[PDB]
Design a protein around this ligand. Sequence first.
Ligand code: SF4
Ligand code: SF4
Ligand code: SF4
Ligand code: SF4
Ligand code: SF4
Ligand code: SF4
Ligand code: FES
Ligand SMILES: [Ca+2]
Lengths: 145, 576, 905, 169
Amino acid sequence: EPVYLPPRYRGRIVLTRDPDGEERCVACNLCAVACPVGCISLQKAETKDGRWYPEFFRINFSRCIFCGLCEEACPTTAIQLTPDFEMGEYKRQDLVYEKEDLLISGPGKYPEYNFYRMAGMAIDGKDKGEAENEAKPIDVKSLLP
Amino acid sequence: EPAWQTRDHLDDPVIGELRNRFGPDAFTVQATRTGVPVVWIKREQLLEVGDFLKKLPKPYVMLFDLHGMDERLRTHREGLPAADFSVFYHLISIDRNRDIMLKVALAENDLHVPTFTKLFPNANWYERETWDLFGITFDGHPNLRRIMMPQTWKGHPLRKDYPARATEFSPFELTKAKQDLEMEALTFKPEEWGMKRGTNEDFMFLNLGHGAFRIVLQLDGEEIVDCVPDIGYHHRGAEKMGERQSWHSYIPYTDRIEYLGGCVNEMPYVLAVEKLAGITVPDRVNVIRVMLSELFRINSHLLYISTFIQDVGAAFTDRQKIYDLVEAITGFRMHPAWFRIGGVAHDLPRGWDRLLREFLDWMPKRLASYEKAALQNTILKGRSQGVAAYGAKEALEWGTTGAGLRATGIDFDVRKARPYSGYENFDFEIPVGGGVSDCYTRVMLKVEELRQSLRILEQCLNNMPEGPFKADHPLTTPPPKERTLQHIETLITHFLQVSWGPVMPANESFQMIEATKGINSYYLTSDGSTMSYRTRVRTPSFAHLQQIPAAIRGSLVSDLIVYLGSIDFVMSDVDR
Amino acid sequence: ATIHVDGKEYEVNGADNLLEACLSLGLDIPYFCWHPALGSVGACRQCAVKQYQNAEDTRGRLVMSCMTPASDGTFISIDDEEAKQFRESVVEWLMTNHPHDCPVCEEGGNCHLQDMTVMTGHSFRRYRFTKRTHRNQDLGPFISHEMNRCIACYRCVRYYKDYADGTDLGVYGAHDNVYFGRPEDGTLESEFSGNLVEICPTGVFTDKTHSERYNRKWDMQFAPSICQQCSIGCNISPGERYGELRRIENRYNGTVNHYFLCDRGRFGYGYVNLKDRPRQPVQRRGDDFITLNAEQAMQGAADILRQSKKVIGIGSPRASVESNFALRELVGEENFYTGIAHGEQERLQLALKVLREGGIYTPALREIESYDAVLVLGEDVTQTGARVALAVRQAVKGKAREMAAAQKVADWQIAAILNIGQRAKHPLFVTNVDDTRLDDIAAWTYRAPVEDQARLGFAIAHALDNSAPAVDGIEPELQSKIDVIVQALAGAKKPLIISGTNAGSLEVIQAAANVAKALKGRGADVGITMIARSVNSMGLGIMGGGSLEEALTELETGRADAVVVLENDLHRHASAIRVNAALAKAPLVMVVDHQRTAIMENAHLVLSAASFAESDGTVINNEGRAQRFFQVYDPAYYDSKTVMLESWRWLHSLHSTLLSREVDWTQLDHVIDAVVAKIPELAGIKDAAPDATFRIRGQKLAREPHRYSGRTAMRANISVHEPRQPQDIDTMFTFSMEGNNQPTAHRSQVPFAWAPGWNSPQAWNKFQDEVGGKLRFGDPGVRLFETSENGLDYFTSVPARFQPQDGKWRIAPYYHLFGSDELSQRAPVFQSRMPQPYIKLNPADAAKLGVNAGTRVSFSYDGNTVTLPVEIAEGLTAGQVGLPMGMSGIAPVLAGAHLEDLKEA
Amino acid sequence: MDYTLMGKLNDMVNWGRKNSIWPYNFGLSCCYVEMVASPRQADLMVVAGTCFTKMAPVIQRLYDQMLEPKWVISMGACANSGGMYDIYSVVQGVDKFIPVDVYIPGCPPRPEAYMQALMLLQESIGKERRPLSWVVGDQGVYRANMQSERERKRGERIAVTNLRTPDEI
Ligand code: SF4
Ligand code: SF4
Ligand code: SF4
Ligand code: SF4
Ligand code: SF4
Ligand code: SF4
Ligand code: FES
Ligand SMILES: [Ca+2]
């Protein structure tokens, strides 16, 4: 039989995508500093429209203690611990998981959160004033008092 | 007047007694958040003060803790005597239900203190650990050698100038240590262990093997004449790690000390940090923490009792059900890392009531099964009664807590004497024994504690309060996640708490709890920073392991094996 | 004065405000609009405390601590409940409109707004309405703009306009739509605009160069270093991550450059991350380039050096004192040559003789701000020594400060001071070949060739003191302006004379020395400042050596058949044809450098030296201050095959291999001891920083913060086994978090400022004895020489006036802050900011040549015909042609040279 | 496939070593009590716990007591790399001093992770080349350079889209 795991189970770590399909991670580095083992390493990169994303994202799973502090620290719900535990390996170097081994094609456990719908910083598809609870930018040369 | 307020405890009668005995200028009272009167004594008056406290009308009978502190990098020492190092002595009066911390200030060039072993014999191992990790000499100590590190170790790792992180691996030192293990028996000098009369031509010296540890046995035939348990094979640098992690990111390390306990080990650390932060948690947090701590207490007690039955010759499904419930709540079975500063990591999952109801409705028949298998078994009873028995005097003088102390008849449980996490809102009994603490009485007390923990779990299930699972404090770490993901100031607070760390104002906090094997305490010194200046963990298994030579003196090796099984201990708890 | 904060008695300065007095005492009061360097305005309303009328008062009143004098017998409370509630309310009001931006904001973890949000204990949003938004502007290649994150604290405009005198930044709009930016998109024109990224408490103005390769402040590995991009020697904190130089932060030094850098130093670090840098020793054999390790590089180099008859060494003003000294020991004192030209060396040793033998006190950069009259002779200070120009602007505002002090207005009340002193300012007289950026505040600007600038200086000295030599042929109008200058300088209590070597004229330095001596003879408190060219120009001058022409002559004559060139491209100091021919003649050329230069094609051996980020050393200030810089990172931590050693380490091991045939990778303190034993004038460099055995209670000084992340992952793609932490035998710093960076530690070298609750550049408050003052245990760096007891004599070599001769064109030097300095103009972000190559002409000379603005003219210098387009220069004088010094192909030795065959291409 | 240093019987020997594996479980720390013969008789060593410096010599000695062929499974973050204990008294990984054949992440891993370790080791022995006798043939071992388990399971792992939300049991 397959082993039942509850939805909260702290197993293999993945990076998720927002509902529009773009990757959720903005490379804010909060997960890496919140890691007590220090087994996350990433670098911020930026697209032409200004969107922050990770240039690389690597996790040393030979070091990781599956404590969930990174997922708790993630302000975009990009990094998530998933109910999977079959991560055994032949060589310890193969336990270093790059971004192509972590970025799944869906939203994971948090199905609808989009951090970029909250951020004031403008990207493609969201100019100034289009975030949540944001008024449109009043130009300083406006006639109104 | 909250429970975390800074108090000097000048209205404690022990302060007036010390003032009337030694004079008003002989000591300095420090105001702390430890909940304990802390007094600074001159080094030359330490033995006099200890002897005076030993002879009070309701005397201070137990040396709870003894350790050191490197005070050189401490920048907030206002109202404190000038010190480069210090040694603290935590002493407990049980008849008074009080405790006092004595502090001796030491200069860097003169790191010697009078030995406390003439007043409390558990000071032997406590002073050996202080010498090992701080380099503080204790004059008059019989065998002042290293107890955590090997004897060929350079430096004292708990000093502030000692690098915490692991040094480079050398194959040559590994072969050297293997060579030292090769003719360790051939070059065995029974003077380097505190033993005597080495080869009467009838004394045999052996090494032996809850964790793996060595004990050197002196045998006259089959009788034990002396023994020295060699510990430190499971030393993980947990306190030094407490200085290298933030207040938030240290919580998994609290888990891995006493790894059968989990959330039980989380509880004193987060309670002490909440004292430092000035956090009063809401009631739902208290009940959640009590429920998880009692589930893990049941798990640890079941493993201990099932191991004791198998060792004598007189278990998994119950622990699997507990692990399934804990896995549903926290996402992890063994090391949940789930308590937080100000609360718990998440709310209870929807469906926890069903799982806890299924666990509680399936357990009492197993309780009857264990009581029949243990209390009514004659082979277990004849194997386990009278072997390694001690009274109240031996449990008080050796710092024995938990089931052994209550088996001596001293009704001392932390959940009733000094309540924490809302344990005063539960109706449960504290089982005590007669005057004799042998293996059978300790195991019987653990079975009765299993029943009482099931009662506490029933009360946790019946009226679980509705409310927040995290406190409304600004220093609740992390903040609630939905407000973090929606609100900018909560995002700011979360950003700073999970990266640099939360800023605990400079103070000292203390919290002792009734753990699964005795009293576990966290003593935390904050220097105003986002990490601990000093994380001292008092564990029961250290003190219980020290009592072994004083209890099986004159017994057999099989009696020693039964005694080792009967002590609820694990080696990670001893060495931390 | 006696104040009582929360019932606790403190002794403070009564001339301070309560905010700076309480921050100096270690108390925490949140604040936004106040800055130690800008004064108090009372805008943000964050710093409220509760003041009581006396000890027997219980009601009190909320006052602003930055606007309240810390007078004697004051009673305040910070921990009052109503004051705490008000401060939390101010943070709440700033949070109502603040964008949800912290993860994608370059200020995160380094943000003062985050710190004061947490410090007030505000973590619950009860505002449910909309946030105002703003469009962003394009502010150029260095500064990124995000107006959403603004809290309208007005620090940016007050710095940029009232402090740095920039004109193109301001506040626009009204009530809650107040906008802070330029009037339109475009590059910020101030040379000191980069200080906005630390002045702004939020993420509005951020470092765009850092934003390209962003990382958070906890992930940075810092070291205390000295800026290498000119001679002013501002202290910097370079920080790295993943083996590349990420950021340059200002390192506080209350004696030099306290809060501010110039843009060249802040943004010109990009040459360190160039991918064409030498990373290994490389030997040229035929057409092959064999890569060597350190040991066999030393063995082969020592063999060829042993077989050669004479070896000469060519140092550089780029290199530290230790590297130049190690080259001097390898080749001998008689065979060591400074890498600068003969005229540059003459001007440099003349400025050194004036500084350490002229009997006139030379001020530190911070002390320049307290002088009462300034005469700048020949120096384009904004383009060559920019932080001195900023200090000169402060000295100019000194008159309004004195006027407001006369009306008993407190010195922190900046708005009242500026209102009292409307347009009044201390006298400033600048002199250049054209207009300068100091002309907006200059009382008078003299545009003339360098001979006429020197003659004006000599005439000022003669008018001040009749024993000074006279000048013949001064026009009556120029004479009237000379008397204006003389009446201003003689009436000042503290006159300051600034000159330097960049004018290309010895006579300008001589005239400045004459003016300073004449003022000293009248009893004035005169100071003199000399701006050198490079980071270690003064140290290379103090050590001394032959000129580059002598080294080239030794190579061309065949007397020297081996040349070791240290950190020198040789084309900025001599003609490229002659340098290339002389180096092709030598059968052994060994270049020790950290940048890919043109002479490495001719080099038989190339040693991959370390730059300032990967090396330790000592550099000498333009004021003679010896300052140690420390290595930021180990280059071999990420690339294991990189052999990038310090230049002194290379040359010391080469000397050891030459003598005893065994390598000796020495220690830095041994080299410094060798310097102070062999050169007694450089004996003060021992006290610049403590040696590598220095500890704070037994532990070393940490290079990176305690929350430094990714220890078991940053190298895991190379190997999953964590490497050994790189050992530092040279300095007292460790390459890890396992060290000390306490604000109360007894040290002078602070790699970065951090205190709990203070994650921003405002954490420098905790490291100072008083806020805006010195570092608590003294600023680092030691002055090499004291003021002489007796001065020099007057220089009687008064030059003749400039005469425009036909066919010849005198080259007037134009310096650019972005472009003239060699290493910074190699940085890729400087190319957009760099001016296009433009040759400057008078309108009369351009009309004589028949050339309009923009048409390309060709000229031959040293047999090399080059072509540049023409810019018309109104302020230049006829017969002079303006060239941008230090650019590609225009060596700085062209200043003062003549030009032939200038014609339209 | 690549290997790092008459055919049917070699496969029979590999099969006999594959379905007959006697483990020697090393206690060490919490990984053992999660996952629950003389070292001369055992041929697989399972190291499950922290390699403390005081008992790294014990681990190395009881590894040297085992006989050829011998395989090593390292359970948990401590035995893999040192885990969360990068501290003065801990050796950073089992593989610092003895060679490891299978690595199992977790703190602790599940018992089923140990069972998956047994399978991975079983095909690891199943397609390896070891000498038949001490006098006949090449006296060298040839371990197979297997495809990594994260490269093999990459497509199914990346194809995951939605997971159960964490508000339930
Ligand atoms: S689960 Fe814990 S140990 Fe693993 S990457 Fe996340 S923070 Fe680090
Ligand atoms: S915390 Fe989340 S968004 Fe930030 S760097 Fe990590 S995975 Fe990316
Ligand atoms: S300026 Fe500060 S508070 Fe605002 S988004 Fe950036 S880091 Fe957050
Ligand atoms: S842009 Fe920055 S410095 Fe200027 S008012 Fe806004 S927050 Fe202050
Ligand atoms: S003035 Fe000179 S030393 Fe100072 S930051 Fe600018 S280039 Fe660097
Ligand atoms: S990996 Fe985790 S569970 Fe296993 S021994 Fe180490 S701390 Fe214990
Ligand atoms: S700091 Fe005083 S009002 Fe802003
Ligand atoms: Ca170095």
